[PDB]
Design a protein around this ligand. Sequence first.
Ligand SMILES: *[C@@H]1O[C@H](CO)[C@@H](O[C@@H]2O[C@H](CO)[C@@H](O)[C@H](O[C@@H]3O[C@H](CO)[C@@H](O)[C@H](O)[C@H]3NC(C)=O)[C@H]2NC(C)=O)[C@H](O)[C@H]1NC(C)=O
Ligand SMILES: *[C@@H]1O[C@H](CO)[C@@H](O[C@@H]2O[C@H](CO)[C@@H](O[C@@H]3O[C@H](CO)[C@@H](O)[C@H](O)[C@H]3NC(C)=O)[C@H](O)[C@H]2NC(C)=O)[C@H](O)[C@H]1NC(C)=O
Ligand SMILES: CCCCCCCCCCCCO[C@@H]1O[C@H](CO)[C@@H](O[C@H]2O[C@H](CO)[C@@H](O)[C@H](O)[C@H]2O)[C@H](O)[C@H]1O
Ligand SMILES: *[C@@H]1O[C@H](CO)[C@@H](O[C@@H]2O[C@H](CO)[C@@H](O)[C@H](O)[C@H]2NC(C)=O)[C@H](O)[C@H]1NC(C)=O
Ligand SMILES: CC(C)CCC[C@@H](C)[C@H]1CC[C@H]2[C@@H]3CC=C4C[C@@H](O)CC[C@]4(C)[C@H]3CC[C@]12C
Ligand SMILES: CC(C)CCC[C@@H](C)[C@H]1CC[C@H]2[C@@H]3CC=C4C[C@@H](O)CC[C@]4(C)[C@H]3CC[C@]12C
Ligand SMILES: CC(C)CCC[C@@H](C)[C@H]1CC[C@H]2[C@@H]3CC=C4C[C@@H](O)CC[C@]4(C)[C@H]3CC[C@]12C
Ligand SMILES: CC(C)CCC[C@@H](C)[C@H]1CC[C@H]2[C@@H]3CC=C4C[C@@H](O)CC[C@]4(C)[C@H]3CC[C@]12C
Ligand SMILES: CC(C)CCC[C@@H](C)[C@H]1CC[C@H]2[C@@H]3CC=C4C[C@@H](O)CC[C@]4(C)[C@H]3CC[C@]12C
Ligand SMILES: CC(C)CCC[C@@H](C)[C@H]1CC[C@H]2[C@@H]3CC=C4C[C@@H](O)CC[C@]4(C)[C@H]3CC[C@]12C
Ligand SMILES: *[C@@H]1O[C@H](CO)[C@@H](O)[C@H](O)[C@H]1NC(C)=O
Ligand SMILES: *[C@@H]1O[C@H](CO)[C@@H](O)[C@H](O)[C@H]1NC(C)=O
Ligand SMILES: *[C@@H]1O[C@H](CO)[C@@H](O)[C@H](O)[C@H]1NC(C)=O
Ligand SMILES: *[C@@H]1O[C@H](CO)[C@@H](O)[C@H](O)[C@H]1NC(C)=O
Ligand SMILES: *[C@@H]1O[C@H](CO)[C@@H](O)[C@H](O)[C@H]1NC(C)=O
Ligand SMILES: *[C@@H]1O[C@H](CO)[C@@H](O)[C@H](O)[C@H]1NC(C)=O
Ligand SMILES: *[C@@H]1O[C@H](CO)[C@@H](O)[C@H](O)[C@H]1NC(C)=O
Length: 957
Amino acid sequence: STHTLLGQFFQGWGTWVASWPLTILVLSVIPVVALAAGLVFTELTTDPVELWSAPNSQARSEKAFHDQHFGPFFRTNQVILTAPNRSSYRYDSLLLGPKNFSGILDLDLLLELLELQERLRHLQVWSPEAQRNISLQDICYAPLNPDNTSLYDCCINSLLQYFQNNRTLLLLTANQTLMGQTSQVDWKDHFLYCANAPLTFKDGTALALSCMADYGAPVFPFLAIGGYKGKDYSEAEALIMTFSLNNYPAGDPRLAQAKLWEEAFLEEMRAFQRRMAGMFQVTFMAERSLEDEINRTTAEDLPIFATSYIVIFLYISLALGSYSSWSRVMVDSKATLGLGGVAVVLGAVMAAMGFFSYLGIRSSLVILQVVPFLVLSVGADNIFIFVLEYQRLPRRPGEPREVHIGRALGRVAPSMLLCSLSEAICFFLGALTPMPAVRTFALTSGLAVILDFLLQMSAFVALLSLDSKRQEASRLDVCCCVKPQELPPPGQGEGLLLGFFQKAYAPFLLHWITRGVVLLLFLALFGVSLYSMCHISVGLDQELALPKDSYLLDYFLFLNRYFEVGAPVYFVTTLGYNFSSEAGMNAICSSAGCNNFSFTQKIQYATEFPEQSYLAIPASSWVDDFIDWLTPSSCCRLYISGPNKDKFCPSTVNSLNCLKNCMSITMGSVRPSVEQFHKYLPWFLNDRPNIKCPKGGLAAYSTSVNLTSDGQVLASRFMAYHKPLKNSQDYTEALRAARELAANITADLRKVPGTDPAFEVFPYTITNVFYEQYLTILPEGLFMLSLCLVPTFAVSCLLLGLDLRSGLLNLLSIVMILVDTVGFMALWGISYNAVSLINLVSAVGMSVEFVSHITRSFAISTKPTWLERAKEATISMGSAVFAGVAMTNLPGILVLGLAKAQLIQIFFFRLNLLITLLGLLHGLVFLPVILSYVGPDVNPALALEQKRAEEAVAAVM
Ligand SMILES: *[C@@H]1O[C@H](CO)[C@@H](O[C@@H]2O[C@H](CO)[C@@H](O)[C@H](O[C@@H]3O[C@H](CO)[C@@H](O)[C@H](O)[C@H]3NC(C)=O)[C@H]2NC(C)=O)[C@H](O)[C@H]1NC(C)=O
Ligand SMILES: *[C@@H]1O[C@H](CO)[C@@H](O[C@@H]2O[C@H](CO)[C@@H](O[C@@H]3O[C@H](CO)[C@@H](O)[C@H](O)[C@H]3NC(C)=O)[C@H](O)[C@H]2NC(C)=O)[C@H](O)[C@H]1NC(C)=O
Ligand SMILES: CCCCCCCCCCCCO[C@@H]1O[C@H](CO)[C@@H](O[C@H]2O[C@H](CO)[C@@H](O)[C@H](O)[C@H]2O)[C@H](O)[C@H]1O
Ligand SMILES: *[C@@H]1O[C@H](CO)[C@@H](O[C@@H]2O[C@H](CO)[C@@H](O)[C@H](O)[C@H]2NC(C)=O)[C@H](O)[C@H]1NC(C)=O
Ligand SMILES: CC(C)CCC[C@@H](C)[C@H]1CC[C@H]2[C@@H]3CC=C4C[C@@H](O)CC[C@]4(C)[C@H]3CC[C@]12C
Ligand SMILES: CC(C)CCC[C@@H](C)[C@H]1CC[C@H]2[C@@H]3CC=C4C[C@@H](O)CC[C@]4(C)[C@H]3CC[C@]12C
Ligand SMILES: CC(C)CCC[C@@H](C)[C@H]1CC[C@H]2[C@@H]3CC=C4C[C@@H](O)CC[C@]4(C)[C@H]3CC[C@]12C
Ligand SMILES: CC(C)CCC[C@@H](C)[C@H]1CC[C@H]2[C@@H]3CC=C4C[C@@H](O)CC[C@]4(C)[C@H]3CC[C@]12C
Ligand SMILES: CC(C)CCC[C@@H](C)[C@H]1CC[C@H]2[C@@H]3CC=C4C[C@@H](O)CC[C@]4(C)[C@H]3CC[C@]12C
Ligand SMILES: CC(C)CCC[C@@H](C)[C@H]1CC[C@H]2[C@@H]3CC=C4C[C@@H](O)CC[C@]4(C)[C@H]3CC[C@]12C
Ligand SMILES: *[C@@H]1O[C@H](CO)[C@@H](O)[C@H](O)[C@H]1NC(C)=O
Ligand SMILES: *[C@@H]1O[C@H](CO)[C@@H](O)[C@H](O)[C@H]1NC(C)=O
Ligand SMILES: *[C@@H]1O[C@H](CO)[C@@H](O)[C@H](O)[C@H]1NC(C)=O
Ligand SMILES: *[C@@H]1O[C@H](CO)[C@@H](O)[C@H](O)[C@H]1NC(C)=O
Ligand SMILES: *[C@@H]1O[C@H](CO)[C@@H](O)[C@H](O)[C@H]1NC(C)=O
Ligand SMILES: *[C@@H]1O[C@H](CO)[C@@H](O)[C@H](O)[C@H]1NC(C)=O
Ligand SMILES: *[C@@H]1O[C@H](CO)[C@@H](O)[C@H](O)[C@H]1NC(C)=O
């Protein structure tokens, strides 16, 4: 047997370590200090939200292709106003009749918003390293003037961009006589005209105001107002103000300038929120806000979390003392054992984190917030079980205490090796997740558990050999430097936990009426959890990642309640498509003699059913606008002759020298040639729209087409908009629907004669990297749990020498614990994600402590009947399991309920509490009752004695 060999080795090792305690203490404490000294050398914490993306996923490669060919997506800063206390009012329009206007659409509130926007556009920030003051124009996203950017070329979207941010145009007034009705046209008529026709250069009213933004692009009504249903724009309940900035890679120095300006913007918006208390109800969001809202509560929650170490120091040496009398309460306190155990757990956690800081592995908030208080839950169990088995084992006559300590260690050492080995294997198998923040946490927890077992095989055995040598002396517990007293002798009264209660609790549990009741209650609980696991929700809401006292939660409430569209989505066409042949242009069209089921018509028909697809606004095509930009009327022109014979006549040139159209006439469905396409495409892409040529140019498609030196098209993107997505299920369904529509597009686009294979069209959204995991998280989680359940059962049958019946009977208990945990997690509204998956994977290994000790104690009992063996196994090991395994993880788990971040308080406190209570209930109430009915038969258990006697005679030389 390979169990008695491990027991004999641990007996000899325990005798040697007890013989050389000071040497083993110094040679085990110096390497731990050497490993833990590197918490400064390369100790860095990864703060952004790129810890929540798999770097090799398909979405990450699509983002890499998009950022390579078009530049990164811009940073967004948003404000939502929604003045709630004002009443709506009736307005008699001249071109539309009677209408209801909201209370927020008033001139005074618009003037206050114009003041806030003008003050926020002129904000300047000092970059700290002796540089210049950073203005908005250095960092703003200018869509149609990126090189020589000005302060009025920045993309700022709001309602006031309909009036070009001009306070005089907002107060403009003129009366119009329409059907003999002189009526006072004002700003409301112009806003009603621009809400329906955003690309307009002359208003159709008495006041002939323009409608374009001051930087030159049209502003759509869903980017400027919210809270309306349909096309009743005047009843909008919210105003939206957006500042868009350029995005750069993480090493770039301009990202620091953008983040400094975003911090100044956030301080200015907090001042505006305090100033307008009885007027608006402002909520705001900067692009940097989520990262420093996630990484904010760590330092203010670590010292509150550190009181569990003091509580676990208190619980040891009060549950391990000997209260035989008041004359010797101080001498048997065992406080040195609790202090050594807390030092062992702290040293193991610090050594694991220091070793990972040696290799340059970045830390995160989850590691610093739950690793020292999750390792502490499972680290003191083996220490408490070893000390309790040492106390319960009587000493033979004429036996030294070193041999006694080795003999006590040799009985419980393989089971406490099995528990730590199963926990380490479960953590390392759970470290196969794609998420880096979960992978580093799993690796740190597994290394901490391995170092904890290696520390408690040597340093705790040396400390227990040391403090038990002052106990035969009359030295006091922690004040052992002096004061040895008379000390009347102790008695073997069996204690209170082992003696009194378990020999008055075991009669209750193993009654004939308690056993059947426990069986048909646990089976019904298993069936109810099996039914209730199917109502579980897959995903992780972003609002759960924030603290409760966060300003981002009010923003997410207003965004989910008032926005009419979601984030923009780009359908990107990669390398391979021609775009220059007529057959390639007909497969992209939407009008004028093109194909019946094209790209854009497919997207538009997808937008007609916004519950099946998740698109609300149809895609804008550069191909269609290029086709009807080339339609000849005052739009593309060529010079007749001169110094420039045929160069280009833009629309801002008045002369008789520009009379020839770029294209010709008399052909229906005007398609340019290959030469005309390659010659005329950059002029369309650089053309600025105006009153006599509003048709298109660099406002929308200057950055949506990548060209080469020859003038061919490498890649393209077509922009549409999602519907409002409120939860992670909406994000995952929108990603799946967009990918299915892109595959349907690609299968049709590949049929065009000339398009090479491997051309594809894919959807790109800024949030795609965070929600691609949930398409395939369920079978990967089932595969990880099935892979974790194998080696625990494999190593529980060679280490402990268990029979197949004993090996199956606790595998059943672990499966019931997992099923009941998933059922209660469905009941409590705990979603299924990577964090809860790693918690369940750790719970597979933590639950072997509840069952393996009791099963091994039942298997090695030479009692006559089955009920007597179950009673002896309960009284022997269920008391130790309750006092150690069930009680050490209560403080570390219960201190995480004061977490102040919702992720720690939901996925680590509630789930670990459910796993602990279900494991205790399945270990101490179900396992003895199921063992009393069906269990292993009696086995020869004298092999342990006849192999222990050889080591006990080998311990003297
Ligand atoms: C239009 O599309 C072209 C081709 O993708 C793109 O040029 C590419 O720009 C990206 C980003 O700047 C570069 O990654 C890429 O090649 C870069 O150039 C160096 C010097 O030769 C290479 O050694 C590197 O592979 C790489 N640099 C880095 C940081 O990886 C570059 N490729 C070429 C051939 O130009 C244009 O930028 C796109 N145009 C627009 C307007 O974005
Ligand atoms: C995208 O589609 C375009 C339209 O089919 C392609 O343009 C075609 O390129 C051909 C060469 O590959 C041209 O044939 C050459 O033209 C001469 C002069 O007309 C002909 O005598 C020859 O057949 C041929 N050259 C030789 C070998 O002498 C096609 O005329 C031309 N099509 C049209 C209608 O202009 C592009 O090549 C294609 N782009 C890519 C990247 O494949
Ligand atoms: C270990 C766990 C720690 C990591 C947890 C990570 C949780 C998930 C974080 C999601 C991050 C992305 O979060 C998302 O960011 C974008 C930034 O454009 C915000 O989007 C913002 O800009 C877009 C423009 O593109 C607007 O349409 C939108 O209204 C605005 O809010 C989204 O409203 C926010 O949901
Ligand atoms: C805001 O609009 C007003 C009116 O259109 C602009 O004032 C006009 O400016 C032009 C050129 O300077 C003058 O010829 C007009 O006589 C002015 N009209 C009035 C009534 O003042 C003003 O320039 C605009 N402001 C901005 C910032 O462009
Ligand atoms: C946190 C880590 C470092 C704790 C584990 C340290 C272990 C692996 C180390 C610490 C002290 C070491 C012992 C120190 C001295 C000796 C005596 C030598 O003649 C044989 C090896 C032996 C017996 C070593 C075995 C390995 C040992 C027990
Ligand atoms: C009982 C437990 C909690 C005690 C151990 C706590 C350890 C793991 C914690 C407490 C304070 C922490 C440090 C607090 C601040 C910083 C600065 C930061 O730029 C790098 C990480 C670093 C250096 C942390 C490393 C981990 C740390 C040392
Ligand atoms: C005449 C006999 C019955 C006197 C009995 C008095 C005994 C039972 C009293 C005296 C001191 C008491 C102990 C003081 C503190 C603790 C800490 C707690 O974590 C376990 C219970 C325990 C250990 C108490 C159990 C009850 C106790 C041991
Ligand atoms: C990020 C990329 C580039 C590097 C590879 C990272 C991942 C895939 C690697 C790094 C270290 C690896 C672990 C190293 C050791 C073990 C212990 C073994 O018993 C099970 C596998 C396990 C747990 C590995 C799983 C995969 C792992 C986590
Ligand atoms: C995974 C973590 C928790 C524990 C790892 C502990 C490992 C290193 C331990 C457990 C069992 C050990 C073995 C037990 C038996 C012997 C026989 C002895 O004559 C030589 C050493 C040797 C062969 C040991 C080497 C170290 C060993 C493999
Ligand atoms: C063996 C263990 C798991 C048994 C104890 C489970 C306890 C802690 C669990 C099981 C079901 C849980 C409840 C399930 C649902 C709700 C409704 C929610 O709006 C508030 C919390 C509340 C009221 C939970 C409180 C905690 C709860 C009572
Ligand atoms: C405006 O709201 C009032 C509420 O009573 C309603 O009577 C009227 O029909 C509404 N007018 C329009 C144009 O919707
Ligand atoms: C910003 O920059 C200039 C040049 O460094 C500096 O002199 C000036 O004082 C700064 N602006 C303000 C308002 O302080
Ligand atoms: C940029 O614009 C300014 C103001 O119009 C002009 O003076 C300057 O010459 C321009 N710079 C370049 C690079 O042409
Ligand atoms: C039309 O215009 C003026 C100024 O807006 C207005 O005050 C007046 O009532 C109107 N004039 C006439 C014809 O009554
Ligand atoms: C609206 O008015 C009520 C009563 O005056 C007040 O309690 C509430 O806070 C106000 N809300 C806002 C945002 O003005
Ligand atoms: C569909 O295709 C045919 C032939 O190309 C065309 O005549 C028709 O107008 C298209 N749509 C329909 C059926 O109206
Ligand atoms: C594309 O695939 C099939 C076949 O054309 C079609 O039924 C489906 O509706 C399309 N995809 C989506 C999501 O519309």
